């Protein structure tokens, strides 16, 4: 599992594993995922043909 965004640059060796949805836009997301409501955890789906 990876991400594309987090709210701040981390200090060295911190283990913030929180999956709180980022409100990138002005939308009050509050758990509703979508555009400008980006869920953190994503996957890359590694294939042998990559």
């Amino acid at each position: 599992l990876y991400r594309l965004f987090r709210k701040s640059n981390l200090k060295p060796f911190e283990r913030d594993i929180s999956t709180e949805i980022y409100q990138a836009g002005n939308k009050p997301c509050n758990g509703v995922a979508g555009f400008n409501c980006y869920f953190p955890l994503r996957s890359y789906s590694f294939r042998p043909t990559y």
């Binding site: 060796f13 911190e14 283990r15 913030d16």
Partner: protein, 43 residues
């Protein structure tokens, strides 16, 4: 840590003088800690 016995006066705080503390305990915890609290023996 350091420990000293003082018996001269009770109500005054932080007795005047110089004392050297010594290293005892190291613990690789790796925890983001911003707050703490202390425990008391209660009846």
């Amino acid at each position: 840590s350091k420990h000293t016995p003082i018996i001269v006066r009770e109500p005054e705080d932080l007795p005047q003088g110089f004392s050297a503390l010594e290293p005892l305990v190291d613990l690789p915890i790796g925890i983001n800690i911003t707050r703490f609290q202390t425990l008391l023996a209660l009846h």
